[PDB]
Short mmCIF file of C-alpha atoms and ligand atoms in Angstrom, two decimals:
data_model
loop_
_atom_site.label_atom_id
_atom_site.label_comp_id
_atom_site.label_asym_id
_atom_site.label_seq_id
_atom_site.Cartn_x
_atom_site.Cartn_y
_atom_site.Cartn_z
CA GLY D 15 0.00 0.00 0.00
CA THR D 16 2.00 2.94 -1.35
CA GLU D 17 -0.81 4.99 -2.94
CA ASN D 18 -3.68 6.66 -1.14
CA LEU D 19 -6.81 4.54 -0.80
CA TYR D 20 -10.17 6.29 -1.10
CA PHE D 21 -13.41 5.25 0.60
CA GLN D 22 -17.03 6.35 0.37
CA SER D 23 -19.88 5.93 2.83
CA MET D 24 -22.78 3.59 2.01
CA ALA D 25 -26.22 5.17 1.77
CA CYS D 26 -28.02 1.79 1.99
CA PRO D 27 -25.86 -0.76 3.84
CA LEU D 28 -28.55 -3.46 3.57
CA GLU D 29 -28.32 -3.25 -0.22
CA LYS D 30 -24.54 -3.61 0.00
CA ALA D 31 -25.06 -6.54 2.38
CA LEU D 32 -27.06 -8.26 -0.37
CA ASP D 33 -24.33 -7.52 -2.93
CA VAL D 34 -21.70 -9.03 -0.61
CA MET D 35 -23.81 -12.15 -0.08
CA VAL D 36 -24.08 -12.66 -3.85
CA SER D 37 -20.47 -11.89 -4.67
CA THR D 38 -18.91 -13.97 -1.88
CA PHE D 39 -20.77 -17.03 -3.20
CA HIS D 40 -19.31 -16.65 -6.70
CA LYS D 41 -15.86 -15.78 -5.34
CA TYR D 42 -15.66 -19.46 -4.33
CA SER D 43 -18.25 -21.24 -6.48
CA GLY D 44 -16.32 -20.46 -9.66
CA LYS D 45 -13.03 -21.95 -8.48
CA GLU D 46 -13.60 -25.51 -9.76
CA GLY D 47 -16.22 -27.65 -11.46
CA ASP D 48 -19.64 -26.09 -11.88
CA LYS D 49 -18.93 -22.36 -11.63
CA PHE D 50 -22.37 -21.70 -10.12
CA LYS D 51 -22.35 -24.30 -7.32
CA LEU D 52 -20.08 -24.82 -4.33
CA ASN D 53 -18.40 -28.18 -3.89
CA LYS D 54 -17.06 -29.35 -0.53
CA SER D 55 -13.63 -27.77 -1.05
CA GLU D 56 -15.17 -24.45 -2.11
CA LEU D 57 -17.72 -24.41 0.71
CA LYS D 58 -15.01 -25.24 3.24
CA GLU D 59 -12.86 -22.41 1.92
CA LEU D 60 -15.85 -20.04 2.08
CA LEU D 61 -16.68 -20.82 5.73
CA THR D 62 -13.06 -20.77 6.84
CA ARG D 63 -12.18 -17.43 5.28
CA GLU D 64 -15.55 -15.66 5.22
CA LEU D 65 -17.41 -16.94 8.32
CA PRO D 66 -14.73 -17.84 10.92
CA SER D 67 -16.65 -16.33 13.86
CA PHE D 68 -19.33 -19.01 13.38
CA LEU D 69 -17.02 -22.07 13.10
CA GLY D 70 -16.23 -22.37 16.82
CA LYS D 71 -12.58 -23.08 15.87
CA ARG D 72 -13.61 -26.61 14.88
CA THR D 73 -11.41 -28.23 12.25
CA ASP D 74 -11.97 -31.96 12.78
CA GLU D 75 -12.91 -32.53 9.06
CA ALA D 76 -15.79 -34.89 9.87
CA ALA D 77 -17.94 -31.92 10.92
CA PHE D 78 -18.11 -30.30 7.48
CA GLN D 79 -19.77 -33.25 5.73
CA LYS D 80 -22.65 -33.07 8.20
CA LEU D 81 -23.18 -29.40 7.35
CA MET D 82 -22.71 -30.11 3.62
CA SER D 83 -25.43 -32.77 3.72
CA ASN D 84 -27.61 -30.34 5.68
CA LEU D 85 -27.11 -27.59 3.08
CA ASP D 86 -27.31 -30.00 0.13
CA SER D 87 -31.10 -30.21 0.04
CA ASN D 88 -31.52 -31.54 -3.50
CA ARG D 89 -28.76 -34.06 -2.65
CA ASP D 90 -26.50 -33.33 -5.62
CA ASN D 91 -23.28 -33.10 -3.55
CA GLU D 92 -23.01 -29.32 -4.08
CA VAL D 93 -24.51 -26.09 -2.69
CA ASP D 94 -26.26 -23.83 -5.21
CA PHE D 95 -27.24 -20.22 -4.54
CA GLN D 96 -30.73 -20.92 -3.18
CA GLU D 97 -29.35 -23.46 -0.68
CA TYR D 98 -26.65 -20.96 0.24
CA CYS D 99 -29.41 -18.40 0.95
CA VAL D 100 -31.19 -20.88 3.23
CA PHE D 101 -27.87 -21.28 5.03
CA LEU D 102 -27.29 -17.54 5.53
CA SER D 103 -30.91 -16.97 6.56
CA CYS D 104 -30.44 -19.70 9.16
CA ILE D 105 -27.26 -18.13 10.54
CA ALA D 106 -29.02 -14.75 10.69
CA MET D 107 -31.98 -16.20 12.59
CA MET D 108 -29.54 -17.63 15.13
CA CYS D 109 -27.90 -14.24 15.67
CA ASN D 110 -31.32 -12.60 15.96
CA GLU D 111 -32.43 -15.05 18.64
CA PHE D 112 -29.24 -14.38 20.60
CA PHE D 113 -30.02 -10.64 20.54
CA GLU D 114 -33.72 -11.00 21.38
CA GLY D 115 -33.18 -13.44 24.24
CA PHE D 116 -30.04 -11.87 25.69
CA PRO D 117 -31.63 -10.00 28.66
CA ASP D 118 -33.09 -13.35 29.83
CA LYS D 119 -29.89 -15.40 29.60
CA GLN D 120 -27.09 -16.08 32.08
CA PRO D 121 -23.71 -17.79 31.56
CA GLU N 17 -14.72 12.58 22.51
CA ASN N 18 -12.90 10.01 20.35
CA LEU N 19 -14.38 8.42 17.24
CA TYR N 20 -13.56 4.81 16.44
CA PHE N 21 -13.47 2.88 13.18
CA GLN N 22 -12.52 -0.64 12.18
CA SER N 23 -11.77 -2.44 8.97
CA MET N 24 -13.99 -5.43 8.23
CA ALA N 25 -11.83 -8.51 7.64
CA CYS N 26 -14.97 -10.67 7.15
CA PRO N 27 -17.58 -8.58 5.31
CA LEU N 28 -20.03 -11.48 4.90
CA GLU N 29 -20.29 -11.62 8.69
CA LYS N 30 -20.95 -7.88 8.86
CA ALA N 31 -23.53 -8.18 6.09
CA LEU N 32 -25.36 -10.70 8.29
CA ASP N 33 -25.16 -8.27 11.21
CA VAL N 34 -26.58 -5.48 9.00
CA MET N 35 -29.48 -7.77 8.07
CA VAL N 36 -30.33 -8.30 11.75
CA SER N 37 -29.86 -4.73 12.97
CA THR N 38 -31.81 -3.24 10.05
CA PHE N 39 -34.84 -5.33 11.01
CA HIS N 40 -34.83 -4.07 14.59
CA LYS N 41 -34.13 -0.47 13.57
CA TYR N 42 -37.74 -0.46 12.26
CA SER N 43 -39.64 -3.27 14.04
CA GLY N 44 -39.59 -1.56 17.45
CA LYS N 45 -41.33 1.65 16.35
CA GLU N 46 -44.94 0.44 16.68
CA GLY N 47 -46.88 -2.33 18.38
CA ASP N 48 -45.01 -5.64 18.52
CA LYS N 49 -41.38 -4.64 18.88
CA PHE N 50 -40.00 -7.71 17.06
CA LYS N 51 -42.29 -7.70 14.01
CA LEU N 52 -42.84 -5.24 11.15
CA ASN N 53 -46.33 -3.98 10.52
CA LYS N 54 -47.26 -2.43 7.17
CA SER N 55 -46.09 1.05 8.23
CA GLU N 56 -42.77 -0.21 9.63
CA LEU N 57 -42.27 -2.41 6.56
CA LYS N 58 -42.92 0.49 4.20
CA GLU N 59 -40.41 2.69 6.03
CA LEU N 60 -37.74 -0.03 5.98
CA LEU N 61 -38.24 -0.65 2.26
CA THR N 62 -38.16 3.01 1.21
CA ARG N 63 -35.13 3.88 3.35
CA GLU N 64 -33.11 0.66 3.32
CA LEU N 65 -33.98 -0.96 -0.05
CA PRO N 66 -34.84 1.91 -2.44
CA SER N 67 -33.16 0.26 -5.46
CA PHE N 68 -35.72 -2.56 -5.25
CA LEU N 69 -38.86 -0.48 -4.68
CA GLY N 70 -39.85 0.71 -8.15
CA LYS N 71 -42.18 3.37 -9.49
CA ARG N 72 -45.11 1.44 -7.98
CA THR N 73 -45.34 3.13 -4.58
CA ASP N 74 -49.12 3.08 -4.05
CA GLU N 75 -50.66 1.72 -0.86
CA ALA N 76 -52.09 -1.20 -2.83
CA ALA N 77 -48.52 -2.09 -3.84
CA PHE N 78 -47.34 -2.29 -0.23
CA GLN N 79 -50.48 -4.17 0.79
CA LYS N 80 -49.76 -6.83 -1.83
CA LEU N 81 -46.17 -7.05 -0.57
CA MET N 82 -47.34 -7.34 3.05
CA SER N 83 -49.65 -10.15 1.95
CA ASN N 84 -46.93 -11.97 0.00
CA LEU N 85 -44.52 -11.80 2.97
CA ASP N 86 -46.92 -12.44 5.89
CA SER N 87 -46.99 -16.22 5.52
CA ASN N 88 -48.73 -17.01 8.82
CA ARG N 89 -51.39 -14.33 8.11
CA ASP N 90 -50.88 -12.39 11.35
CA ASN N 91 -50.59 -9.04 9.49
CA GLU N 92 -46.97 -8.74 10.63
CA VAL N 93 -43.60 -9.64 9.13
CA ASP N 94 -41.46 -11.49 11.66
CA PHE N 95 -37.72 -12.05 11.35
CA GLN N 96 -38.11 -15.40 9.59
CA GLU N 97 -40.50 -13.94 7.00
CA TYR N 98 -38.13 -10.99 6.56
CA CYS N 99 -35.32 -13.45 5.83
CA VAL N 100 -37.42 -15.12 3.12
CA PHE N 101 -37.93 -11.66 1.63
CA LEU N 102 -34.19 -10.96 1.69
CA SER N 103 -33.34 -14.34 0.15
CA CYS N 104 -35.79 -13.65 -2.68
CA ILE N 105 -33.99 -10.35 -3.30
CA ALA N 106 -30.58 -12.04 -3.20
CA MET N 107 -31.78 -14.65 -5.68
CA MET N 108 -33.00 -11.95 -8.05
CA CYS N 109 -29.67 -10.11 -7.80
CA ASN N 110 -27.83 -13.37 -8.45
CA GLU N 111 -29.88 -14.09 -11.58
CA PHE N 112 -28.65 -10.80 -13.01
CA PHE N 113 -25.14 -11.99 -12.29
C1 LIG U 1 -28.49 -22.34 10.41
C2 LIG U 1 -28.07 -23.57 11.22
O1 LIG U 1 -28.82 -24.26 11.82
N1 LIG U 1 -26.67 -23.90 11.25
C3 LIG U 1 -25.55 -23.16 10.56
C4 LIG U 1 -24.40 -24.15 10.78
C5 LIG U 1 -23.02 -23.42 10.73
C6 LIG U 1 -21.95 -24.05 11.16
C7 LIG U 1 -20.59 -23.35 11.10
C8 LIG U 1 -20.49 -22.13 10.61
C9 LIG U 1 -21.74 -21.41 10.10
C10 LIG U 1 -22.92 -22.01 10.16
C11 LIG U 1 -24.63 -24.80 12.10
C12 LIG U 1 -26.12 -25.05 12.00
C13 LIG U 1 -26.48 -26.33 11.23
O2 LIG U 1 -26.83 -26.27 10.10
N2 LIG U 1 -26.44 -27.64 11.93
C14 LIG U 1 -26.73 -28.79 11.34
C15 LIG U 1 -28.14 -29.38 11.89
C16 LIG U 1 -27.92 -30.35 12.92
C17 LIG U 1 -26.87 -31.00 13.17
C18 LIG U 1 -25.70 -30.79 12.71
C19 LIG U 1 -24.53 -31.68 13.14
C20 LIG U 1 -23.32 -31.47 12.64
C21 LIG U 1 -23.09 -30.33 11.64
C22 LIG U 1 -24.10 -29.55 11.26
C23 LIG U 1 -25.48 -29.81 11.82
CA1 LIG U 2 -17.76 -24.74 -8.03
CA1 LIG U 3 -27.37 -29.06 -3.73
CA1 LIG U 4 -43.46 -3.42 15.16
CA1 LIG U 5 -46.27 -12.90 9.77
#
């Protein structure tokens, strides 16, 4: 980084959130095989680099195939965009329930 | 008096946080504080998702949207039904990709 970097505020961050959801999928889904689906190696790379806060530092290797079968609803061994949206929606519902129930919880 | 900023090493995680916090920025204004009524839903759409609104901004347009999103027919949009809405938008955006 030897030149200035310029940044602009976002008027509608929820719209940019949607753009990031779409682009992150294709960042990995186009690495091998079908360019519009995620295979196990691409999904594992996505979660590890893009969603580490949700992985609980678990790297056993057996764990991923359980999630992959969960996400693979049409059972074609890959995750398409619609199944990826079900996944993200599910993560977001979990975060929302943590927020909504927080004042009632204790460690 | 200090202001603080951070870079976002994992922007997909922040996008998820924006999805959650945007919901609650509008759902607590009226009535049930964890669901969007028609008024709250209209405000969220116009302010947070203006690129997906369209010229159709009549009250019949928002009432049809409310009806398409309110799956359990309680005249509110809860967080799950809001997620279905957002996934539909994502899937549209992806088609044009
Ligand atoms: C939305 C949801 O239920 N889940 C998201 C998933 C996740 C794991 C790591 C990083 C980001 C998201 C965990 C969870 C899930 O889908 N669990 C699923 C259902 C039951 C059992 C089970 C067992 C082992 C692996 C996954 C699994
Ligand atoms: Ca692929
Ligand atoms: Ca699949
Ligand atoms: Ca409300
Ligand atoms: Ca409802």
